[PDB]
Recover the amino acids of this structure.
């Protein structure tokens, strides 16, 4: 005891996959990532502050261009992210092969969920203990999270990884559906700022976005990130005088 | 080669002409053209000799397995459609043979023709098949009766092939005929049939 | 008497 | 103690697979889905209250289109739900390919039952945790239930998940066979409020239906939900007064 | 016996597969189903009876035609039947493709059994949860019981399911082989009633039969089930209270 | 002991494969199948009392035809007998296919020993826990017992199953190789009486034989059986006064 | 290219050509067309030397294997039939070559003509294969009597194959003869064969 | 020891495979077989002793033929012997196919011992648990013990089976190369009487031999054993007085 | 007790798979390699001390050519290293085949990270128990450490193996991105001195580098290394005085 | 309780 | 005992 | 701590 | 005693 748990081919007496249930929690150990949806687009914020100063201030990366107009964040094992996004990417270009179309955000995230479903059903393979958030614009912004389970849930603002619990609480009061792109982007830095419970430096977070005017992955360089982080540090100070 | 097959009410008489693979000539005085599929089943063939013999053995083996397996002797219909499935599988391999499966069973007597193109027809009582067939069929239909007996049938089968032998330079000398009388599985043999064709000019 | 599951019937 | 839930290939001495029976109690952990059969249609109601104010309006969403006259709701792991639903679609579209016959509802339930049994027999794979309600009008209304085991049962009203047992009793009194479309729709909402043990609103549920008269699947919109909500709440209030 | 039962490859020290014994207890974990043989045909009944009234008993089945002169009843999971019968139906028909002969009831029985034997041989594949009673008329009437072990046993009246036991005790006294179709139909009805411990109804029994004098499967209509069920219920009442 | 008898890919300190020897206990329990050889052929006798009188007791049957001069009777699990005998049936006809001669007895026995031994030799599959006796006259009488191990033992007379202890111990005293065909038939029928410890009925018994001069396997009809029973019954009662 | 055979009451006689027929070339300066399949069993081949010698080695090996398994001699019949199976595999990818497998076994003696298009004909007592087969057939009836022994059977075997070498002179020198008396497997060699054809000169 | 014998791919801390040691105990379980090499050849003698007279005199078969100049005899699992020798016969036949030469005894032993090792590697497949003494004459006489371990070892004189330990001890004293062909085989009979610890007759021994002079294998008939058996008996009686 | 590191297919309840985090420990018991990356090129320095002087000065190797512009070194098993270094070289060249581009240090790293993740995911194969350093100049010198898990970490200067932690701390102070080729080589050499807890011996360390201005891979010659080592030994000595 | 005669012939 | 095998002959 | 091979280096 | 030592070369 407890379980009925060394196998992925078994449903515990409570009727849970203990094995999978364990892999959503392997996500939490791995780094914070924050997704936030607005009317003007979708920003994906990903933690690049990991490990000693001896390490480069670039930890690949964790905010991948998946398609032209779709990007994803990862939280959990970095290693599991590498193979999972390889299939995602291939499938996004596979979609273009067979329909010659923007891959719908909703549908990529489903077939992403499907890769992790393969590893849920067959007995020789562990699930990946990794979560991607899938942020893009089909022609309206949508933000999703994929779960090691293969569950697919549409969010309006979320966090995953270390900061999941913390950031949920934060977004009950703060999140509004009429937030500005800039205010939303910022709000996303405040949430990261909560994770580490400290003032953010912009040289150790990587932020990308998909707008609904650009309809492209674009990426906000450290030189540009600077004012957005500065307006964040004010709100983060307010939180830590409380 | 040309073959006929007659369904009688006391037996079945199926018929074949002698020729082998010996440069297109008789192996000995005899050539194997008679294949006992089962105890009351015989196989005759118009077309190539080698194909007939190799394919005989598959149907024979499987016929024998059917009897062993179900503790029930086979029927002529069973062997016939069994044959069609085997051909259509083995049509990647080189083959051309028109197959006559026939014998006696609990449903009566019958001869079923199987083609290398496809199905198993039931040829009620009359069958021809070959190249010498046009001639054999002419004298067959006037001297056929449904009320035929095995004595009359040996005479018709020899005669029909004999008419075709004089329009075929590809028909050798000698005819074998096969009797299943439901109490005997008789093979008349080179000697005995020769006299039945030596009521003509031979 | 619940239950043996309804997948036996 | 015992250990015949350690494998799906192993029979208990209690004559049963206890593992299949915990794939049943994976369905029962998930959120409710209800079907109501009338002689005029089949009406499928499923929960969408799940998540906070941080998950979408348009989040899962249970009652997936399988054909143009077949919808199917799910209960259990939403992950396991998608692949069974995808296979469910595929089969439906196979029937239309090879016959040009819009899939018979009875026969769809049958082909999903065989698929969920491939995952029961072999032990290199794991059974599904999920029950689907296959429902449609092939030319009469039918509502069937295919179980985690892959077992076929015909119903004329059912529910799957946690709400089932409340709802079983409710239809055992109220449900009638003389049921018509308007009636059926109000009755099944009544029953859905019992399931969640609270008042309904239209946006914390999604409802699909396949009418006899159209013989098309049409999805219920929030606007179409409203008149049924208003009438339904009269009884939801009376019976949740304890 | 302990631990000689968690794998199908493993005989006990005693010698008998106890894994197979539990798959033969899985037969007894379905409801009673009875076949009674006449020298007129063969009659196959099954307890079509369903618990909650919400299910439609008529559409729930128990009992399928296999060939057009062979019918079979199942006891064991509704699920495991589906694979087994779909296999049997295909197999029953494959014979009619390659010998142009309606499959012999024996042959069918051997072949279903050969299929089961393969599913209780390999260490990778679970045994069948079900048994079928295979009842047709081929040259003479036959009524077989296939075993989850994959053995076949000739019977002249037999049952499977919970009532197997009662039926045995019954037909030991009252079964006779000098019954005609009608007498047999009544006797077969009497026996089901002892198993279920009550009086039958035509609305809650399914009876299928294959006659000598057509060699064609038929399902007794509700209308014509009525007379037979009246005389048998009267006997059933006499037995279960003198 | 243990754990040398929960895998097949194990041995033990004594050398024994206990899994294989517990598959020999599976043969050892149920039920007498007997071979007794002579200079006029080989005679195969086996029981055909099975179950209560509800089972058709005039068939099923251990005396399977395998060619037309090669026959085997079975002992142990019947399910395992069906595929093995089929395999054997086929391996006889493979010999006709490729050599176009009647199979030699020795060879068929040699082949069907190598098959069992293959199922022993690979794990992830079990040995058949069935035994056959292979009886034939190729030109010379031979009687074999082919073992669940996949080993080959030639005898002049033996028996397997429930009756092995009685009939081996019986023949230790009685048997001789100078018996004719008729005298032999009776001596095996005396052997079978003791095994169930009761007087035999021609109906509830079965004899198949392969004679030298006919060279046919024949399956002995009850009518013919009865004169030899008449002879045997006095002997049997006399020795069941001991 | 041609071969001849006659079944004897005290053995099996068959003969081959040493040198292949092409009418201006030979295979090699010394070549062999008579291959020993087993102890009392030979093979005389017509067609390519390449196809036939490959086939002979397989069939020699499996033959040996069957005699080892049974702990008793195998029959020629079984050999002949194995070759039918083998030549059906090698009909998928055609080889065209004609084989004769004969000898002594427990069921008697015969010579079996095994064809690449399948089947086996048990040849009663007269047999040839190749394409000089029709002439060869004729010569062989001339001296055949049921009381012909082995020593008279080689004499006849020479005369049959001299039919082809009569008018196609170049392969008239070097010829082999194989006899099999049930105490030996004797292969005469060219020199000794040469002296009998010394009386027929050419 | 404990858990280092429950599968074949598991080494023990000693760096033994306890599984493979356990297959050698299988060889020590079996019936004795002794091989003796002399300067002119190699005589291989194997116990033909029966259980009872019920068994056939020549129980099929100790001493196998593999080629015409290489023979072998068996001890240990005789079930396994059937498959293992079938492979052996074919490997030597294959060398007559692909090189048209005798297979060297060495190379034949190598190829067979390689086939064992393959099944020791395999974890889903147990190794053979039978030992053969492969014997033959090439350029010189050769005698090998092929082990169930997959090892070949060459001996001047050898033994295996139950009599193994006794005949290694005996022959330390008695064996030398100062023995003729006949005097070697006589010592081997003398050795065999020691294994069994009783007097010999032809009915508990089987002799084949391999001669230089023919350079062929011959299998010796019971008739031509008689002088040698008498000679051997004098010596054996003395061993059974010491 | 645990069972979260019995096989890789189990996640611990903490959420993390322990068995690949125990392949990380495999590295730790193995022996040091330091990569020091500057903007003049990258340097790679790795153990060749190992074992006694029975072994040659070139104990081949830790300094693998991967291309002509990419090198790699290892810590972990040098068994597991050997195959991974094969895979690394073949992969790099395949990129050259299918693109004609000298593979970028980043893209190679990503593929060898994907290949490890093959082994991490499947349970029919164990993790790699090897860490790799991949140092190159594609057009920007870049340095990565590849984890057992198939994970990617970029460093300015890095270590693995025995000295790992001490080197990390020595470079925590002194290393800056601006230090010449001459400085970086000597600095990493002092650090290496510490790793082996003794003065360098120039024949105990093997050193290669990939330069920017050559863009070529070169192996530092034994005596060309000697003055660099000389100035490092002074400092190494100072710190072991404390 | 039977089912020990029943898997065997 | 009474059992010795059969496969150790 | 422990153990440097041989094979762990 | 040793019986595995002679089964290692």
């Amino acid at each position: 005891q407890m379980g009925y748990d060394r196998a992925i081919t078994v449903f515990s007496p409570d009727g849970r996959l203990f094995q999978v249930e364990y892999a959503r929690e392997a996500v939490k150990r791995g780094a914070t990532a924050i997704g936030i949806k607005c009317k003007e687009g979708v920003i994906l914020i990903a933690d690049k502050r990991v490990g000693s100063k001896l390490l480069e201030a670039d930890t690949i990366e964790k905010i991948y261009k998946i398609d032209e107009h779709i990007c994803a964040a990862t939280s959990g094992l970095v290693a599991d992210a590498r193979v999972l996004i390889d299939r995602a990417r291939i499938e996004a270009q596979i979609n273009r092969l067979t329909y010659d179309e923007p891959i719908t955000v909703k549908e990529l995230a489903k077939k992403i969920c499907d890769f992790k479903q393969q590893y849920t059903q067959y007995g020789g393979v562990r699930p990946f203990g990794v979560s991607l958030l899938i942020a893009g614009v089909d022609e309206v912004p949508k933000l999703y999270e994929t779960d090691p389970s293969g569950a697919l849930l549409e969010y309006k603002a979320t966090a995953i990884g270390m900061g999941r619990n913390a950031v949920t609480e934060f977004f009950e009061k703060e999140y509004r559906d009429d937030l500005s792109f800039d205010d939303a982007m910022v709000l996303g830095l405040v949430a990261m700022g909560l994770s580490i419970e400290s003032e953010l430096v912009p040289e150790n977070i990587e932020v990308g976005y998909v707008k609904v005017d650009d309809r492209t992955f674009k990426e906000v360089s450290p030189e540009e990130l600077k004012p957005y982080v500065e307006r964040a540090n004010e709100r983060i100070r307010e939180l830590l005088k409380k | 080669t040309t073959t006929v097959g007659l369904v009688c009410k006391d037996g079945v008489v199926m018929a074949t002409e002698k020729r082998a693979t010996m440069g297109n000539f008789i192996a000995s005085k005899a050539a194997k053209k008679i294949y006992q599929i089962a105890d009351r089943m015989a196989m005759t063939t118009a077309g190539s000799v080698g194909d007939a013999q190799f394919l005989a053995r598959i149907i024979k083996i499987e016929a024998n397995l059917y009897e062993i397996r179900r503790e029930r002797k086979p029927t002529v219909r069973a062997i016939a459609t069994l044959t069609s499935n085997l051909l259509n599988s083995y049509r990647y391999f080189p083959y051309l043979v028109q197959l006559l499966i026939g014998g006696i069973d609990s449903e009566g007597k019958s001869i079923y023709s199987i083609d290398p193109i496809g199905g198993a027809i039931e040829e009620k009582d009359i069958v021809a098949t070959g190249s010498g067939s046009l001639t054999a069929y002419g004298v067959l239909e006037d001297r056929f009766t449904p009320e035929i007996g095995v004595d009359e049938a040996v005479e018709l089968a020899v005669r029909a092939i004999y008419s075709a032998m004089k329009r075929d330079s590809a028909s050798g000398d000698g005819i074998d005929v096969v009797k299943i009388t439901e109490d005997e599985f008789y093979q008349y043999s080179p000697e005995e049939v020769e006299q039945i064709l030596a009521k003509f000019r031979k | 008497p619940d239950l043996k599951g309804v997948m036996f019937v």
